[PDB]
C-alpha cells in the first residue's frame, strides 16, 4: 500500500511552486493529487518548501498534536503554503475550493525510522 509518509507528501508537498498565484491552484491541485476521488477532502494544506526542509520539522519544536498524541512538530521559520477549503457550492464529484496562500508555521506528526511526517496538523 501507499506508505504514510508517502501519502504526507502526495497530499502535502507541492515544492514546484513558490505560492498558489492562481485562483484555479486548489481546483486542480486537489484532483490531480487524488484528494477528490472518492469525496470532497475539505481542508487541504500544500507546502511549497523543500522535501528536506519539511522533513527536518521533525526535530524542531515539539508540541501537542490537536488529537492528544504527543509527536508534532512546529517550524520554526514559517513556509510558504496554500490552504484549499471547499466552497459550498461544491458537490461531489466536482469539488471547488478557495485557494489561500499563507506564510505560516507548519505543525506536522512525525513518525518513523526514519522520523518523517506522516500527518499535516496544522498552521500557525
Ligand atoms: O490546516 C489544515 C487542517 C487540516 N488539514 C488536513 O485535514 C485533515 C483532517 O484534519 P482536521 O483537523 O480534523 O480538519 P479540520 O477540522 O477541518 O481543520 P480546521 O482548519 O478547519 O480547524 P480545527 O481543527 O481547529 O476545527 P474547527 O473547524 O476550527 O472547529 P471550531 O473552531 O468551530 O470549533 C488533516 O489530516 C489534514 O490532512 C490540512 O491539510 N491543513
Known sequence: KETAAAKFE????????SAA??????????????????????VNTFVHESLADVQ?????????????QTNCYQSYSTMSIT?????GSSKYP???????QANKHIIVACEGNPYVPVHFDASV
Do not use: I
Open 56 to 68: 527536518a520539522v521533525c526535530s524542531q519544536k515539539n508540541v501537542a498534536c490537536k488529537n492528544g
Open 10 to 17: 502526495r497530499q502535502h508537498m507541492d515544492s514546484s511552486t
Open 21 to 42: 498565484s492562481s485562483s484555479n491552484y486548489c481546483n486542480q491541485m486537489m484532483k490531480s493529487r487524488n484528494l477528490t476521488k472518492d469525496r470532497c477532502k475539505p
Open 83 to 87: 490552504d484549499c477549503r471547499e466552497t
Open 94 to 100: 466536482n469539488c471547488a475550493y478557495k485557494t489561500t
